[PDB]
Design a protein around this nucleic acid. Structure first.
Ligand SMILES: NC[C@@H]1O[C@H](O[C@H]2[C@@H](O)[C@H](O[C@@H]3[C@@H](O)[C@H](N)C[C@H](N)[C@H]3O[C@H]3O[C@H](CO)[C@@H](O)[C@H](O)[C@H]3N)O[C@@H]2CO)[C@H](N)[C@@H](O)[C@@H]1O
Ligand SMILES: [Mg+2]
Ligand SMILES: [Mg+2]
Ligand SMILES: [Mg+2]
Ligand SMILES: [Mg+2]
Ligand SMILES: [Mg+2]
Ligand SMILES: [Mg+2]
Lengths: 142, 88, 182, 220
RNA sequence: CCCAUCCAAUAUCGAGUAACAAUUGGAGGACAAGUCUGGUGCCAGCACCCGCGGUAAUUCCAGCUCCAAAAGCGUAUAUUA
RNA sequence: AAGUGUGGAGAUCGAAGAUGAUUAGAGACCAUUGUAGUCCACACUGCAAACGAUGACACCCAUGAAUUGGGGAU
RNA sequence: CACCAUGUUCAA
């Protein structure tokens, strides 16, 4: 009950497939422009921003902590986002009005497990790497 | 001369299996309903000889109910069982 | 920018990086042949994979086809030339049976161990890389040098090496200077 | 010792049935695992456990727990058998699956892809086998391919004597209880397909229990 | 410049802790590799996913010891399988 | 089916609403009512678990009770 | 066929 044969039925099969590829959430995201115009990074990776304020986001059930994260405002398009600060400590390396280099983390913008509504991640603060500051490879300028 | 060969003419496979005499169906090793039935060849005085006619039937054919129709069709062909009365 | 010199990749990393059966075989191959890293095994995989793939294409082709007489007599020629197959093996179905230790036996690190010029396979890799073995009066400093069959007769010490007919090496020579100032 | 109860095991112990293909010919159930290790040589018969996983039964006051063990057995020359038993201790169910895997021993037809030149490297035709939703399909491969399969069918296809094969798997293969028994059902179908080699008429034989009926009555 | 050749051709400097010192990610599972010791006590943090952490943590912070790839190795975003 | 428009009809049941009662509360179930509706004509709507949760047209397909309409034998 | 509503968060 599914599809058509016929030696001259190729226009039917070409039209049939081009509409059913829009139902694929990978094909539709790769071929519509709401994907990049609403992505806070401009269809790119690692956008810079300025730290505005520090937030403690409480973990989801069944976990219980508060996740240390900053809210930053990106430079390329002035979009306010909340981004996580990975490691033990590490808001001690971030002050307000710091330029931070913010990547996503994990899952193509889908909020890695415990943290609710945070889908970006601090990589580098004041143009020195944030994991290099944790392991004390080098220290902050100024 | 049955079973696959080598291009050197040695019989490569183990176990050439039986085939159903009704349906020509190759009898598998786990087909535990498949039976052989040996029918005694008998002589002119009505006493059995030392030779028997053996016919083997596959297991699905017995499962349906169609084996008894197949034993008739075989033994008419082999000449074992007569198809009708003689004329009075 | 307008440079047309070519380059490709010679090895490939395996799918499934943690297979306990595969990781045990390759540590045996790093020990029995004195190898630096798993990547030297992995190019011997790709070298043999490409032979195993072309020779499996040619058997799809019939005999008395042009691409099987030519180029099927080339792949049997380079197996016989480099010692991958002895001269009895001539049917092209033996390239499909070659293994990674069949290729690793033809490295200059292995023959210098097998000919007897070194005590261990880690003695052989030092003496190649420290400029002691000449294949045809040609100092070869490459351990992955695949030795041909005709080259086996002529592997010896280098004529410039201290172990051959050359000047004495460093520890004798810097000691011969210290006995000279006195 | 081992005293047999079935007539087949009486004839195996008496060396009246000499090989295992004399049982496969007459479709006889084995019913005694001492038949198999008698007929197959002891060093030429390999076994190892495929999977062990626990299955639980909700009861009043908690769960009951028994371990379901999968074993595969076979020399790598066309005999394969898989058995799945369960038990309270993990050591009992491993031992019971060894007993079970020998009872399910079954032959594998092997053949050629292209020309015929030696021992058969592959299965003689495309065959699928289905248990649950998991159906594996086994396709003949050329002479130097290897077994191209997932590592649970690949270990079964090594023990069955198949040297080069292509393999697909259609659905929920992470269920290994049905993935194991679908590779077994597919290799079991290799003597079910009627090829024009086997078109010829073969002369009928006599059952080992037909022929040796006078000897078996002397055990009573 | 580099590489290559050379430490006499009468006559050329040089390894030892070869200190001339390998790193990057891991050790519950997938996924290779600790029922080790110290600390913290649903905190701090880890965790792609499943999950860890509530005073005996196989998962955090560390020391040891191992595993993996190795002059490399993590991470992020695209993209093919 | 509910709903809408214009005319009829208006017996009974009855969304809304009104009284009783139950209840911690009762805006509900239960009792008494009662408007729109129910019913017809002519227009409009086109929203169902509009179901067999099974698209249409062909093909092959084992068995035994029955059943509806047509035809044929006794 | 009177009335009969509810039981914090993880974990075992
Ligand atoms: N979810 C984030 C994932 O991260 C990936 O990002 C990268 C890495 O995480 C990943 O690195 C993997 C490494 O994790 C894994 N342990 C081993 C693997 N060899 C690495 O792969 C990388 O390194 C090798 C060098 O051998 C390169 O040759 C190879 O091209 C490269 N992909 O390869 C990717 C290349 O940088 C994917 N880009 C991304 O699509 C995916 O979503
Ligand atoms: Mg020199
Ligand atoms: Mg501890
Ligand atoms: Mg640790
Ligand atoms: Mg009441
Ligand atoms: Mg009323
Ligand atoms: Mg309440």
């Amino acid at each position: 009950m599914t599809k058509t044969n016929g030696q001259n039925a190729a226009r039917k099969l070409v039209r049939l497939r081009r509409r059913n590829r829009w139902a694929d959430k990978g094909w539709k995201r790769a071929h519509t422009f709401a994907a990049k115009k609403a992505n806070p990074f401009g269809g790119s990776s690692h956008a810079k921003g300025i730290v505005l304020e520090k937030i403690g986001v409480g973990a989801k059930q069944p976990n219980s902590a508060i996740r240390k994260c900053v809210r930053v405002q990106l430079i390329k398009n002035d979009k306010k986002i909340i981004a996580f600060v990975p490691n033990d400590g590490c808001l001690h390396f971030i002050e307000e009005n710091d330029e931070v280099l913010v990547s996503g983390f994990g899952r193509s913008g889908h909020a890695v497990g415990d943290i609710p509504g945070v889908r970006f991640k601090i990589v580098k603060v004041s143009s020195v790497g944030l994991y290099a500051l944790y392991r004390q490879k080098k220290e902050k300028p100024r | 001369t049955i079973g696959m060969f080598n291009e050197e003419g040695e019989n490569v496979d183990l176990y050439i299996p039986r085939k159903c005499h009704a349906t020509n169906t190759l009898i598998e090793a786990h087909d535990h309903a498949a039976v052989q039935i040996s029918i005694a060849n008998v002589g002119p005085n009505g006493v059995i000889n030392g030779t028997t006619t053996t016919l083997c039937i596959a297991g699905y054919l017995r499962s349906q109910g169609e084996s008894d129709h197949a034993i008739n069709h075989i033994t008419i062909d082999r000449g074992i069982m007569r198809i009708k009365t003689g004329k009075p | 920018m307008r440079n047309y010199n070519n380059f490709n990749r010679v090895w490939k990393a395996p799918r499934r990086p943690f297979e306990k059966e595969r990781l045990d075989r390759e540590m045996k191959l790093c020990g029995q042949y004195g190898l630096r890293c798993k990547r030297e095994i992995w190019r011997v995989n790709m070298t043999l994979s490409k032979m195993r793939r072309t020779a499996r294409l040619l058997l799809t082709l019939p005999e008395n086809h042009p691409r099987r007489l030519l180029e099927g007599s080339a792949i049997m020629r380079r197996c016989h030339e480099y010692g991958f197959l002895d001269e009895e093996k001539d049917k092209l179905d033996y390239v499909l049976s070659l293994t990674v230790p069949d290729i690793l036996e033809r490295r200059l690190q292995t023959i210098v161990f097998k000919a007897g010029l070194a005590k261990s396979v880690h003695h052989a890799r030092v003496l190649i890389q420290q400029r002691h073995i000449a294949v045809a009066k040609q100092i070869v400093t490459i351990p992955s040098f695949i030795v041909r069959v005709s080259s086996e007769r002529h592997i010896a010490f280098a004529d410039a090496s201290p172990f051959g007919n050359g000047r004495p090496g460093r520890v004798k020579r810097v000691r011969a200077k210290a006995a000279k100032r006195h | 010792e081992w005293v047999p109860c079935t007539k087949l095991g009486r004839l195996v112990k008496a060396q009246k049935v000499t090989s295992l293909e004399e049982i496969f010919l007459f479709s006889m159930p084995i019913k005694e695992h001492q038949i198999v290790d008698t007929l197959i040589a002891e060093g030429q018969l390999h076994d190892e456990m495929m999977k062990i996983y626990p299955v639980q039964k909700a009861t009043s006051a908690g769960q009951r727990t028994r371990f379901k063990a999968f074993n595969v057995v076979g020399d790598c020359d066309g005999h394969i058998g898989i058995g799945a038993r369960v038990g309270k201790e993990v050591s009992l169910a491993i031992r019971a699956s060894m007993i079970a895997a020998k009872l399910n021993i079954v032959p594998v037809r092997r053949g050629y892809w292209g020309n015929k030149i030696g021992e058969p490297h592959t299965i003689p035709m495309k065959v699928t086998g289905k248990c649950g939703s998991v159906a594996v399909r086994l396709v003949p491969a050329p002479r130097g391919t290897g077994i191209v399969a997932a590592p649970v069918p690949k270990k079964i296809l090594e023990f069955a004597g198949v040297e080069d094969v292509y393999t697909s798997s259609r659905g929920k293969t992470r269920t290994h209880g049905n993935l194991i028994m679908a590779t077994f059902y597919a290799l079991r179908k290799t003597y079910g397909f009627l090829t024009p080699d086997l078109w010829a008429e073969t002369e009928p034989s006599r059952d080992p229990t037909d022929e040796h009926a006078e000897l078996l009555a002397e055990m009573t």
